[PDB]
């Protein structure tokens, strides 16, 4: 069904690198150059206070929407990814349900400024104090710490492209029907990532990459904080949360 579902040669690994980098460039949602230029555009003390004064349900809804929009670009990235559309519909859904949020969390490090510990949110850069109305400081601080540790790696766009393809194409996801097909696809993508790192003398980042349990823990904490919000405002989730968000994180 696809070349990368079997053993690939060096030349085909080289093509896979260009393919993944292209798929990512066309689906990155926000341009890195726009994110870097906006670093000086920081929310005022008055603006931060206005966000803190917002109700919990309103902040949750704003955040669920922005996350949902980011996930749509991840779905488009998956669709352009070599071998993804050749997998069955069950496996594509399994891979996106388990991995879309993890891909968004990795993509996030581009919108995060380690110099002043601020993130790009609704047109400007703000610290974690901007999300105080959410009432999930542990999850927010954990996301900020994770983006801070990824920022220290100084990832290029090509490295993000390749690493993020691997976050998504994970053959160990429970519920995969064609596990062997996913395994071979993951192997070729592992080779493509390691090949590009070898070529750019960036193999030193391999030991510095976050453990796979770190991304799973963040996702499990997200689903947990959602359930606590759901108990407090069930009609807010049912009526105002994006349908795509509920499909991935509620059930």
């Amino acid at each position: 069904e696809n070349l990368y579902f079997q053993g690939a040669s060096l030349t085909e690994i080289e093509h896979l690198v260009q393919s993944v980098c292209k798929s990512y460039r066309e689906t990155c949602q926000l341009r890195l150059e726009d994110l870097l230029r906006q670093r000086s555009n920081i929310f005022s003390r008055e603006e931060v206070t206005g966000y803190q004064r917002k109700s919990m349900w309103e902040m949750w809804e704003r955040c669920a929407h922005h996350l949902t929009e980011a996930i749509q670009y991840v779905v488009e990235f998956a669709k352009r990814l070599s071998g993804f559309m050749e997998l069955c519909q069950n496996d594509q859904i399994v891979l996106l349900k388990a991995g879309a949020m993890e891909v968004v969390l990795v993509r996030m490090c581009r919108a995060y400024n380690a110099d002043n510990r601020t993130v790009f949110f609704e047109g400007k850069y703000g610290g974690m104090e901007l999300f105080r109305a959410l009432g999930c400081s542990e999850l927010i601080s954990s996301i900020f710490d994770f983006s801070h540790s990824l920022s220290a790696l100084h990832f290029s766009e090509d490295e993000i492209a390749l690493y993020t393809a691997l976050v998504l194409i994970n053959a160990h996801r429970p519920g995969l029907q064609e596990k062997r097909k996913v395994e071979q696809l993951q192997y070729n993508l592992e080779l493509a990532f390691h090949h590009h790192l070898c070529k750019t003398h960036r193999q030193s980042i391999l030991a510095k990459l976050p453990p796979k349990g770190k991304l799973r823990s963040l996702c499990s904490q997200h689903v947990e904080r959602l359930q606590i919000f759901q108990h407090l405002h069930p009609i807010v989730v049912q009526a105002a949360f994006p349908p795509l968000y509920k499909e991935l994180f509620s059930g």
Binding site: Q72, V75, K79, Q89, Q92, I93, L96, K97, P243, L244, E247, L248
Partner: peptide, 12 residues
């Protein structure tokens, strides 16, 4: 259900 996800995946 996976209504939205199926639709996004099918929409070519």
């Amino acid at each position: 259900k996976h209504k939205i996800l199926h639709r996004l995946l099918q929409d070519s």
